[PDB]
Design a protein around this ligand. Structure first.
Ligand SMILES: NC(=O)C1=CN([C@@H]2O[C@H](COP(=O)(O)OP(=O)(O)OC[C@H]3O[C@@H](n4cnc5c(N)ncnc54)[C@H](O)[C@@H]3O)[C@@H](O)[C@H]2O)C=CC1
Ligand SMILES: NC(=O)C1=CN([C@@H]2O[C@H](COP(=O)(O)OP(=O)(O)OC[C@H]3O[C@@H](n4cnc5c(N)ncnc54)[C@H](O)[C@@H]3O)[C@@H](O)[C@H]2O)C=CC1
Ligand SMILES: NC(=O)C1=CN([C@@H]2O[C@H](COP(=O)(O)OP(=O)(O)OC[C@H]3O[C@@H](n4cnc5c(N)ncnc54)[C@H](O)[C@@H]3O)[C@@H](O)[C@H]2O)C=CC1
Ligand SMILES: NC(=O)C1=CN([C@@H]2O[C@H](COP(=O)(O)OP(=O)(O)OC[C@H]3O[C@@H](n4cnc5c(N)ncnc54)[C@H](O)[C@@H]3O)[C@@H](O)[C@H]2O)C=CC1
Ligand SMILES: [N+]
Ligand SMILES: [N+]
Ligand SMILES: [N+]
Ligand SMILES: [N+]
Lengths: 359, 359, 359, 359
């Protein structure tokens, strides 16, 4: 008996969430899976406008009593400053729930358009392992000599032995379990003269632990190009918070698009609920036009299943299914405008809704 | 009567530098231009191995007596830690010479291969304006509780009203002088909760100064994708140190490559020499195989001219020439392996060496 | 025609302020001095309770239109957190008015009790020069991993070439004008490994500017003892913000007491109003018992005069007077409980009120 | 069978150390105590001049094999920068040996001179509990815009939940075991707006754990005065690194002197050796004149015993003895120039050497 917390948040969160739930309830009934959903108004800019705070003070004790989070997106600069909204909701989720891994599997699905030249289709496959607790995402620092010629602004990056070690481990593992078993650590150990060399110190230190696994270390600029221009190289790519919510948009949209970009925010020791979300944001530019690609949002529930079940081949089943459901509709051509289709958001929700049965 | 300081530095710096000088001495003689070159051993890892320091203590007083710097690249991790080498040489150049603008013009040259799908050729053109004195490139911070379970690592980002204002100005200017006059400021004002919102505060503040110029502000992740997938959008793109030596590799290699990527490190008030370099690094992987694309290195001297002359239509002339010299050889197909050609570095040096006369 | 802003603030500010004004209006009338007082409710915890903020948003434009500030004290932990109240009022005064010098003359007045053993009386005399804009008084930093085993708390000290140079200058000056011309810079350049050595670097650098002036540098611990045990040594003592509102209590109370401790918050270039206050705080423990020593508060107005007049021997006159008015009452024995007397606050206000005429 | 590591270090360390050892070997033989001394050249400026580093790389593995450290003092600005020398030796001791408590018992010994007025003699007694791992003693930060008008200098204070909690505990304990059971936490939670309020947050939090123990919290300025002027008040005084090596000189020399000031650097869980030292430093001003008060140095060995024995009443015995040995010689008048005596350092060593037998 599972319990799932669903939060559409802002913008297209409301839009793509019901079509994530939809294609999931299909497998639920279809495979005898204990999926008992719920919806929460907070973690939105409506809630913030109304209450002064992004969520109620007791959000956690609330959520702690659930198995997983199915999250939409958060942000509406029109009405709420972006830091306020991310820090006040999602950031507190990942943070106070110790979901230190943020993964973003990157792939070309049979027949997806290519914003890269003539690569064999499917010859692209890897995951991106993003530090999600610390690093360059901070609230530390402040403004000095405010409003004067001499104005200074400080921002601390904080790297610790724990967050780094643990995210570095969880990457000599997702490679310890693959065909290539290769790792590229991202760094900028020429620019940053204190943080990155350290990161490299610990990268290097834990290569000595998995001697069969093969690793290199590429400066985030080149890595970004190599990302677009030679995605066959990469198997595992491990990175700091910033070198996470970076790449995340580039990659899943290196050739394809950010509409088909899944992400997972994980607490491996299960001591807290993990959270599942697409890579994209609230996209105010597109909201209420139901044209938004819900694949990322779907792919997300799939991963929610894949992770969530653990000890069942039962839940495992559902994943592959749903990704094939994705896979068909892709080449079947029932897609959203940011991929070719003339279809709508719910259209593409209903298009997946079919294939799951047909096979 | 000009004086130019030439420093190949490490790796392919030695390799691409003599072919930068070459195609430049052609125009010099060809247009009556006061180019009196010189070469310096230091800012290399040979020098560092030998002397303990990347350059002599009196490098500056030395260089201050020259008009411009033609720089190769610096770095050799095999023998010198990357931060030590960048900080000890080039970083001190840009820093102690107040070369706060770092620009990287991004373009498709007639017939360049496309790591983006079917775009009109030449339908891509913009410059990237990179803060080069402060920002996320620091030596501030350090390690606490060293070697223990509790190990912490601090890195300060420092933004000031001066460096920010001045780089933001110098961008409502390179657009104040163009067909589109559009600016995209890069930010991550949802992740970074102190630095980026401030940056945006000052971005916004100086949009009120150039009301004809049009601006938006895109989070560095999306901006990176939009970089690859829709480069026609961008005219001017302004960014912090990190959001500089980032993009710089992606962009000039969004479709094309980092071999044809020029950069300029500028001190507009001319109080110090400006420095001219390609975007790429010492590329140990390729050194001594004379296959390295010297275009970036050439394009660099061109820009050295373009900037350096100022009040001459005399020097201006040379630029356009040399870029056409580039332009022909491109479509003429006399290029290096990272572009299609079977040619060598000096081959491609000699290939440019021709066209400059023929027209 | 002068204009004075009077702000009692919290606690005994209300108490000692009317007795500062009192003995001042005496000299005003007595010497033909343009003193046109005013009183402001804000910079108090009553105002903060009422308005949510320590003062109105337009406090500055308001105050900018006045010549000097006669300030009480600020703080009431019972109702307002101490940082909130200091930062929200007085700290903004000293800060946004560029009052970078904070001086605290330390002396034994004929017949004051001695919390030091058998020193010649009057054999003690020096001033303390306190950096008042930057240093260890910051709002920079923050909390990371909040509420967890791993909780970390960051606080930045910021030293700049401006604030340091300028406070160091203004000290090779108050000694350039004295019998001894000696300077002790306070440091802790063994503990603090970045800030203090730098401070010393610049201390040292500006000893080369006033070669007749004699200087040493004593670690703040020893300096504190030497403060109590050998106060004849010190002429000038220059220090960082923290090594300011430190000493300030010790010294003026090394033997005597914090009730007779004047301070001056100065903007030498007069571009802003200077502020005048006693060294002590709101002293909630004593409030509304009118036993509080108003000397510090009086001594303060005296200094307000001494500084304020500048180009008059006219205003200068008043000072010496008022300090003799102090001096008599001291040995005359008309003092408050923290000095021996059975008298009240207004009693001691009226006791000074006399002597000013009698001579 | 104990093993003791003795390190005179610099200056008067060499001077007062043999007279610490002396009066200790007396009790050793006198009480059947396993004291097997040794002497080490390093942690000195001679060693540093010679080797480039304050101690050998393997100092720790060396020392780890000993029970306690009897330390002299470190520092010689004439030849070695003060931070280099403290950080390179003693600071690494306290740090890498997790000696997080630094205690400084403050007392008037029968007939000691009084740099405070007419207090009952012996009516003064308390200990000072100093955080010794973190706080305001850092190597974090650095210099930005070096050598320019805009020069900035950053220093991080780091407070953690561990170091703070643990030093705060170890103080609701040294009071949980006394006549008064009172605690004064030192703070400056009006100046420092991030660190001190936090410190207070955790002070307050752990008052809820020892409800019988009574506590207040005094701003470090006033606390310093109250230190001199009313030392009967204090029982326990708990403080951050800076508010440690501060007070430490003031207090033990509030009336008396820094020559009779003991300190203890403790690792309560005994997982590492604890270190024992006087409060004073190398005192270059006095070195080689054998006039230096070795009481502090003796008092230190006494405490080394007091702590070291633990489960023996055997070693306990020795302490009281040795302090009475101190106590007599004090009133007996066999003291050093900084207390009245005409005696020398070894004279006063031999003076203690007697009394230990006579009773
Ligand atoms: N994890 C989260 O909750 C995230 C929230 N945000 C927030 O959302 C707001 C907007 O951020 P942006 O920079 O625009 O990033 P975004 O993801 O909201 O939009 C990026 C671009 O992709 C388009 N897009 C996004 N999802 C799409 C879909 N599935 N199908 C077709 N097109 C799609 C949008 O129109 C936009 O042009 C901001 O307030 C930002 O802070 C941004 C990133 C992640
Ligand atoms: N401005 C500067 O002096 C720079 C120096 N470096 C330093 O140089 C070293 C190597 O850095 P990387 O991460 O490899 O960046 P890189 O520029 O040295 O090489 C990046 C990739 O591009 C290739 N490449 C570079 N220039 C090329 C050319 N013109 N033609 C064909 N291929 C080319 C290289 O083989 C490599 O695969 C490091 O020590 C780094 O710190 C890196 C960037 C800039
Ligand atoms: N410049 C300013 O506005 C200052 C404000 N404060 C604030 O005031 C509040 C109390 O701070 P404390 O630590 O008690 O320092 P305080 O100055 O308020 O009191 C220190 C001690 O001296 C006594 N005292 C002060 N002035 C006296 C006088 N003239 N005659 C006789 N006794 C006197 C008080 O009873 C108390 O025991 C806090 O909220 C603090 O932040 C503290 C220092 C300076
Ligand atoms: N724990 C340690 O190893 C300490 C080392 N130092 C270092 O030692 C050097 C000197 O520091 P200072 O600021 O002078 O503090 P200090 O302790 O070396 O001397 C302070 C004053 O007390 C006198 N003094 C010290 N011990 C005495 C004794 N037992 N009897 C009579 N007089 C005594 C000295 O002459 C001097 O006037 C510096 O290099 C400093 O960094 C300073 C404090 C502690
Ligand atoms: N999302
Ligand atoms: N370069
Ligand atoms: N005050
Ligand atoms: N010591």
């Amino acid at each position: 008996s599972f319990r799932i917390a669903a939060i559409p948040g802002d913008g297209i969160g409301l839009e793509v969430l019901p079509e994530g739930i939809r294609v999931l309830e299909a497998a639920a009934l279809k495979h005898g899976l204990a999926l008992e959903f719920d919806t929460f108004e907070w973690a939105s800019c409506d809630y913030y406008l109304q209450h002064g705070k992004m969520m109620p003070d007791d959000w956690a004790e609330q959520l702690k009593q659930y198995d997983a989070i199915y999250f939409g997106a958060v942000g509406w600069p029109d009405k709420v400053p972006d830091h306020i909204s991310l820090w006040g909701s999602l950031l507190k989720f990942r943070r106070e729930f110790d979901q230190y891994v943020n993964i973003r599997p990157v792939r070309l699905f049979p027949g997806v358009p290519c914003a890269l030249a003539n690569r064999k289709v499917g010859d692209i496959d890897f995951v991106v392992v993003r530090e999600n607790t610390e690093g360059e995402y901070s609230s530390l620092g402040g403004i000095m000599f405010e409003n004067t010629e001499n104005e200074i602004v400080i921002q601390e990056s904080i790297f610790t032995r724990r967050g780094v070690d643990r995210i570095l481990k969880y990457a000599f593992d997702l490679a310890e379990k693959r065909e290539r078993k290769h790792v590229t650590s991202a760094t900028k150990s020429n620019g940053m003269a204190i943080s990155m060399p350290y990161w490299d110190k610990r990268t290097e230190a834990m290569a000595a632990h998995y001697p069969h696994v093969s690793w290199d270390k590429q400066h985030i600029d080149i890595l970004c190009a190599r990302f677009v221009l030679q995605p066959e190289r990469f198997d595992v790519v491990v990175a700091s918070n910033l070198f996470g919510d970076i790449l995340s948009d580039l990659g899943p949209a290196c050739a394809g698009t950010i509409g088909i970009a899944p992400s997972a925010n994980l607490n491996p020791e299960r001591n807290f609920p993990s959270l599942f979300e697409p890579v994209h944001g609230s996209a105010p530019d597109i909201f209420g036009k139901n044209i938004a690609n819900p694949i990322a949002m779907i792919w997300s529930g799939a991963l929610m299943l894949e992770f969530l079940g653990q000890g069942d081949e039962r839940y495992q089943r559902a994943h592959d299914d749903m990704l094939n459901a994705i896979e068909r509709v892709i080449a079947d051509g029932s897609v959203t405008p940011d991929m070719g289709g003339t279809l709508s958001t719910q259209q593409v929700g209903a298009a997946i809704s079919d294939t799951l049965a047909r096979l």
